[PDB]
């Protein structure tokens, strides 16, 4: 009846629309089916502009490649939002949404109404939350165990890269989150850790730095490159050509006044420079061994750079805005806007300050701080895409470790959470649940879809997913009557099971909680959509 | 039956997106795609290597055999080839040496991997085979090193470093090209022995000036920088000697103008009559303080007005224009001067020293001579390069930069660490890795033994480009390495290498007399980049492209 | 409501004032209702009667997408 409303329109409903959500989500899951797992495939994206994106993150695949199918657009926005808050779960939600649609599609063809199928999803999901309380293991942060943070950080590292880059980046991420934990317990992920792309040596040479690093360096040669003790002065005011306010200008009567009025431009510049000299007169003690540096947020007039060169003062201009907020955490001083009020208390402290000039760009390194409140991670790579591959590998590992210190609990990985829900939902009595009659079928479709992820991990290893899970179910049968509580994982190397607690495989708490809740709402809205049409004014 | 389903449910992505996976022989096509550009760089390897012509979209022609330079102008399509292209560019920037080795070695690792994949080796086991074999490779390079550079500068020792590097790039005459580069290196060295200071070197200090005409034998080394400039007021040979006092101003020479609404204000005719003579007294008062200090030359960084150039010709002061920045920055390093923006009298301690400034015709235009003399040594010397064709002038400029980059390798490490040349470095590693493959049980020995087979390309390339049969010459070279080591020490058989043309049959005795060696710091990063370049291609199971 | 200079934030920080990014006109009407404040354009006419009070809590929580500032009412 749509052809009468619009001259030209396209629409698909009932069995035509039922194949839209099931088939489109099947082709999207197949792309990320080989992605999941540490042995998963590696994909490279090359656009028409010549850029190269090489990563295993499923979020980059969705954002770079356009999707014509509207069904995957709902999944792409759900998978992208999962990586935003929790830093993980992009490929997990896609495997949950795509599979749950197919597991429930077999009963739709049998004549079961989609609503009573989606109603069983909420009943089965609420049981996963009640089971989540007994499934999680409490961890006390008062012990300050470093080995616990090492095994959790290696979960996301072994997935993105191999053991070569994992052993290098494991102590770097651990040392970065070590300074995040404080007596205040507040964890701020953005200001504590950054990603700075620089091409030097090899990617395996990436090292950790305990102090802020900047992309700028001294323009004048006489500026000291290495300063033992430097006092960092935070200046947010810029000395340079101003907007001048509509450019009114000067008018000179005689040629002697022409050069007399030209000296007024340096009057305002030298006015703020005398305050810095007066501040240097307090720290003048032990001047040869110590030093004084200036870090500006905005560009500095090259006319005034020769003033700092005679006093051996390092000047930094055009610094980032976020870097101004971290100068109090690194050095320990305070920020100063107006130069009228200056005190030695706001001056920072650094034990080592040096600059390494590579190519045309010059970088400034700061380290050896008394009580540094923040640190950095210097990313090194051989190629442009190598900088992005490490950027996506480290950043995804930040939210995984940061979420551990937020709560007191941690979730074991290696498919131990998905297998436990299969035996829980299938063996649970329906009288306790609010679902009865045909709604019992919707719960079974949700429990069977959770067993594909542990089977997806095996598909990348080459082993038969059906035979490797036969020994997993047989171990959990005798474990209940033996008075032994042990979680069974999946080891892809030997094709047998394992223990995630002994092997060190752990997953974040916020990732799986938001993934199941997010994937359920996506698949439910797709099963409840019986018609897909396109209309609009263009 | 008439038309295929044409891959149903393919509307998930745009029609321009294509999916290529290691299955269906596409990983073999990716390796076969390397061989298209691999054979291009094989004929360019060695002193007998052949240069290539590449015409860009703008019409500029760059004739060079360097793999890093050739891949810049070429438009690359296949994604995994860009991994090999960008791998050669990093080797040229970092060490400035061993660019053709990274291109050839990374290409041969994929060729031998075609047989490894056909036998069923997974991509994971192949990567572990190269990583374990590369760690053993880097450890054997430090054991086989012989000799050292010791002292920084020497007349003879600099012929064992820059000369073998520039022998592959525009071979031509040996001693002619080696003396020109080795002379400019000794000038930029601070020396100061026994002082314990940290040595320093700059790869951008030595500048190559391309001047058409003449011959290569007429080239020389100039301690000062050479530019094409025309003196404004007058030309002076400056035969009055007693050197000179020179000052450099990064700001132009002219009356200071207000940055906002510069305007002449005259209220009455009394101020108008003194306005013309007022500006003349301003430059006179400013230029008088400079002339009183004995400054015979002034370097300007921008356009200078005519009123300022008048009084400069009164005292006989030369005028120099230094546009942009980097051109003016290296001028002060020669004379040791510190620029200041003001037009007032410079500080006597900031004035430079240049004994003579000459203007003569070289390539048909007037050039200014900043050349220094024995005393009052200067830094950042330039090399005048004379040639008939401009195409040869471009690659020789990069050939000199390869010798300048080799000097940087004498600073950061503990020494030069010379390695046997003529391909003897990669051949000795074959017998060592072969013994290493047997010492490791398991299935990983397949990738380790084939990793040493990829090193056979160096002796085969030097033998093929020399017009010799690789089947006769190469097995005859293993006769020296098949006898292992005798019951007595002092074994010189490690100096055997591949010879070009001549009488063939190995030859040139031991390369110790030939003086051609290789750098250890170059071979360290050349193997690491080439291995990671081939590992990246083998670590990608599926390739996705857009628009094509 | 509009942008703020980096010079004005210093003298406000010395006295204890807090600076924020420019605010749309739609949000200015909702803030005045919660704290009972009155919008004051003229700085010279600012008085204690138009200052908002009875604010429960002011906190900022970290979320990867954007920052979030909370203003609680004393009810």
């Amino acid at each position: 009846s749509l052809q009468l409303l619009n001259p030209k329109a396209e629409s698909l409903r009932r069995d035509a629309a039922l194949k839209v959500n099931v088939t489109s989500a099947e082709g999207l899951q197949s792309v990320l089916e080989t992605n999941l797992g540490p042995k998963g495939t590696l994909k490279m994206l090359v656009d028409g502009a010549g850029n190269i994106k090489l990563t295993k993150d499923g979020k980059v695949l969705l954002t770079e490649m356009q999707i014509q199918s509207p069904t995957a657009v709902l999944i792409a926005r759900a998978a992208a939002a999962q990586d935003e808050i929790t830093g993980d779960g992009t490929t997990t939600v896609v495997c949950l949404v795509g599979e749950l649609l197919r597991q429930a599609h077999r009963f739709i063809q049998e004549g079961v109404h989609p609503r009573i199928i989606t109603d069983g999803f909420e009943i089965a999901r609420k049981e996963s939350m009640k089971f989540l309380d007994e499934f999680k293991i409490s961890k006390t942060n008062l012990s300050n165990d470093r080995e616990f943070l090492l095994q959790v950080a290696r979960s996301s590292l072994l997935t993105k890269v191999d053991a070569d880059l994992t052993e290098v980046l494991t102590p770097i991420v651990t040392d970065a989150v070590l300074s995040v934990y404080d007596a205040q317990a507040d964890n701020l992920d953005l200001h504590m850790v950054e990603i700075m792309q620089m091409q030097h040596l090899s990617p395996k040479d990436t090292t950790f730095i305990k102090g802020l690093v900047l992309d700028h360096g001294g323009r004048h040669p006489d500026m000291p490159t290495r300063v033992k003790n430097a006092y960092v002065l935070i200046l947010n005011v810029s000395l340079e050509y101003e907007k001048t306010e509509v450019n009114s200008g000067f008018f000179y009567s005689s040629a002697d006044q022409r050069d007399k009025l030209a000296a007024s431009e340096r009057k305002f510049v030298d006015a703020k420079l005398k305050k810095i000299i007066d501040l240097k007169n307090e720290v003048c003690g032990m001047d040869p061994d110590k030093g004084f540096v200036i870090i500006n947020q905005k560009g500095i007039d090259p006319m005034s750079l020769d003033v700092f060169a005679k006093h051996n003062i390092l000047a930094l201009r055009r610094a980032k805005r976020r870097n101004m907020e971290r100068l109090q955490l690194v050095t320990g001083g305070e920020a100063q806007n107006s130069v009228e009020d200056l005190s030695p208390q706001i001056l920072g402290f650094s034990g080592l300050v040096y600059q390494e000039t590579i190519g045309e760009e010059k970088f400034t390194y700061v380290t050896e701080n008394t009580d540094p409140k923040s640190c950095t991670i210097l990313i090194k790579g051989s190629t442009h895409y190598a900088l992005a591959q490490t950027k996506d590998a480290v950043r995804d590992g930040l939210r995984a470790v940061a979420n551990v210190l937020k709560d007191k609990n941690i979730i074991p990985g290696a498919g131990a959470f998905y297998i436990a829900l299969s035996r829980y939902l299938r063996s649970a009595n329906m009288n306790k649940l609010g679902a009865k009659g045909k709604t019992k079928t919707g719960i079974e479709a949700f429990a069977e879809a959770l067993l594909v992820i542990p089977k997806t991990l095996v598909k990348n290893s080459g082993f038969d997913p059906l035979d490797v899970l036969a020994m997993v179910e047989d171990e959990l049968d005798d474990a209940q009557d033996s008075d032994e509580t042990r979680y069974v994982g999946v080891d892809l190397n030997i094709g047998d099971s394992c223990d995630p607690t002994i092997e060190g495989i752990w997953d974040s708490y916020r990732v799986l909680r938001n993934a199941i809740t997010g994937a359920t709402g996506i698949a439910s809205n797709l099963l409840l959509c019986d018609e897909l049409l396109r209309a609009g004014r263009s | 039956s008439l038309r295929l389903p044409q891959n149903p449910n393919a509307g998930l992505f745009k029609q321009g997106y294509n999916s290529y996976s290691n299955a269906d022989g596409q990983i073999i096509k990716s390796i076969a795609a390397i061989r298209e550009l691999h054979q291009m760089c094989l004929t360019s390897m060695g002193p007998c290597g052949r240069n290539k012509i590449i015409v860009n979209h703008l019409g500029k022609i760059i004739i060079t055999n360097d793999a890093a330079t050739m891949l810049r102008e070429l438009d690359i399509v296949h994604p995994a080839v860009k991994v090999l292209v960008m791998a050669t560019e990093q080797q040229k920037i970092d060490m400035g040496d061993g660019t053709n080795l990274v291109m050839i070695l990374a290409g041969e690792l994929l060729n031998v991997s075609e047989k490894l994949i056909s036998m069923g080796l997974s991509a994971v086991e192949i990567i572990q085979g190269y990583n374990m074999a590369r760690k053993f490779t880097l450890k054997e390079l430090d054991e086989m090193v012989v000799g050292e550079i010791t002292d920084k500068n020497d007349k003879n020792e600099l012929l064992k470093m820059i000369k073998p590097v520039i022998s592959s790039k525009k071979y031509g005459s040996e001693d002619i090209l080696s003396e020109l580069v080795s002379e400019a290196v000794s000038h930029v060295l601070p020396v100061a022995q026994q002082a314990g200071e940290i040595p320093y070197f700059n790869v951008d200090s030595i500048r190559v000036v391309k001047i058409m005409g003449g011959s290569l034998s007429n080239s020389t080394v100039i301690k000062g920088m050479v530019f094409n400039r025309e003196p404004e007021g007058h030309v002076k040979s400056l035969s009055e000697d007693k050197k000179h006092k020179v000052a450099v101003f990064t700001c132009p020479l002219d009356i200071a103008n207000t940055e906002t609404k510069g305007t002449v204000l005259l209220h009455n005719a009394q101020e108008m009559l003194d306005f013309s003579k007022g500006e003349e007294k301003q430059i006179d008062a400013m230029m008088k303080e400079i002339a009183d200090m004995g400054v015979e030359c002034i370097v300007a960084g921008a356009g200078v007005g005519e009123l300022a150039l008048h009084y400069l010709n009164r005292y006989g002061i030369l005028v120099l224009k230094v546009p942009s920045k980097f051109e003016l920055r290296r001028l002060c390093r020669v004379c040791g001067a510190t620029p200041l923006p003001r037009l007032g009298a410079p500080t006597p301690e900031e004035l430079g020293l240049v004994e003579t400034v000459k203007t003569m015709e070289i390539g048909g235009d007037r050039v200014t001579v900043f050349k220094q003399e024995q005393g009052e040594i200067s830094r950042t010397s330039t090399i005048i390069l004379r040639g008939a064709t401009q195409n040869n002038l471009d690659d020789i400029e990069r050939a000199i930069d390869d010798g300048v980059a080799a000097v940087k390798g004498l600073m950061k490490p503990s020494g030069g660490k010379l390695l046997p040349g003529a391909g003897a470095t990669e051949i000795e590693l074959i017998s060592r890795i072969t013994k290493y493959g047997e010492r490791t049980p398991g299935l990983l020995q397949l990738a380790i033994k084939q990793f040493a087979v990829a090193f056979e390309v160096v002796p085969r390339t030097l033998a093929e480009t020399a017009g010799l049969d690789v089947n006769e010459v190469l097995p005859n070279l293993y006769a020296a390495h098949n006898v292992t080591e005798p019951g007595a020490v002092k074994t010189d058989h490690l100096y055997k290498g591949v010879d070009i043309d001549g009488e063939s049959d190995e030859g040139v005795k031991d390369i110790r007399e030939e003086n051609i060696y290789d750098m250890l710091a170059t071979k360290k990063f050349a193997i690491n980049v080439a291995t990671e370049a081939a590992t990246t291609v083998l670590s990608i199971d599926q390739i996705i492209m857009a628009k094509k | 409501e509009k942008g703020v200079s980096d010079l004005a934030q210093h003298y406000l920080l010395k006295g204890g004032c807090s600076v924020l990014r420019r605010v749309k006109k739609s949000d200015n009407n909702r803030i005045a209702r919660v704290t009972g404040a009155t919008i004051v354009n003229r700085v010279e006419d600012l008085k204690e009667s138009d200052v908002g009070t009875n604010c429960g809590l002011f906190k900022v929580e970290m979320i990867g997408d954007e920052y979030f500032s909370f203003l609680d009412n004393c009810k």
Side-chain angles (χ1 to χ4, degrees), chain A residues 120 138 165 216 273 279 284 395 427 448 481 509 520 534:
Chain A
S138 178
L165 294 174
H216 300 290
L273 296 175
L279 178 63
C284 60
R395 182 177 181 171
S427 296
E448 183 178 2
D481 291 344
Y509 176 78
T520 300
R534 182 182 65 196

Side-chain angles (χ1 to χ4, degrees), chain B residues 408-467:
Chain B
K408 183 178 179 180
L410 297 175
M411 298 297 180
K412 183 178 179 180
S414 296
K417 302 299 183 181
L418 295 174
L419 295 176
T425 299
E426 295 84 357
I427 294 170
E428 183 67 14
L429 296 174
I430 296 170
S431 63
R432 295 183 181 276
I433 294 171
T434 299
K435 294 177 179 177
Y436 176 77
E438 183 67 14
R439 294 182 182 175
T440 299
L443 297 175
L444 296 175
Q445 63 180 19
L446 296 175
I448 295 170
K449 293 176 179 177
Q450 294 300 321
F451 177 79
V453 177
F455 294 160
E456 294 178 351
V457 64
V458 176
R460 291 183 295 102
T461 300
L462 296 175
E464 183 178 2
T465 59

Side-chain angles (χ1 to χ4, degrees), chain A residues 44 164 201 256 258-259 382, chain B residues 90 131 257 279 282 544 546:
Chain A
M44 180 176 282
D164 290 344
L201 294 175
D256 291 344
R258 182 177 181 172
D259 290 344
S382 63
Chain B
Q90 185 175 356
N131 290 337
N257 291 337
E279 294 178 350
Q282 295 296 100
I544 295 170

Side-chain angles (χ1 to χ4, degrees), chain B residues 209-258:
Chain B
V209 176
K210 292 181 295 297
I211 294 171
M212 293 178 70
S215 64
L216 178 63
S217 64
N218 290 283
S219 296
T220 188
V221 176
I222 302 301
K223 295 177 180 177
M225 295 178 73
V226 175
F227 295 96
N228 190 30
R229 299 289 182 269
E230 182 178 2
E232 296 301 321
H234 293 84
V235 295
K236 293 181 181 297
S237 64
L238 298 174
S239 178
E240 294 177 351
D241 68 21
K242 294 176 179 178
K243 294 184 174 74
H244 292 85
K245 293 177 179 177
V246 63
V248 176
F249 296 97
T250 187
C251 295
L253 276 67
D254 188 4
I255 301 300
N257 291 337
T258 60

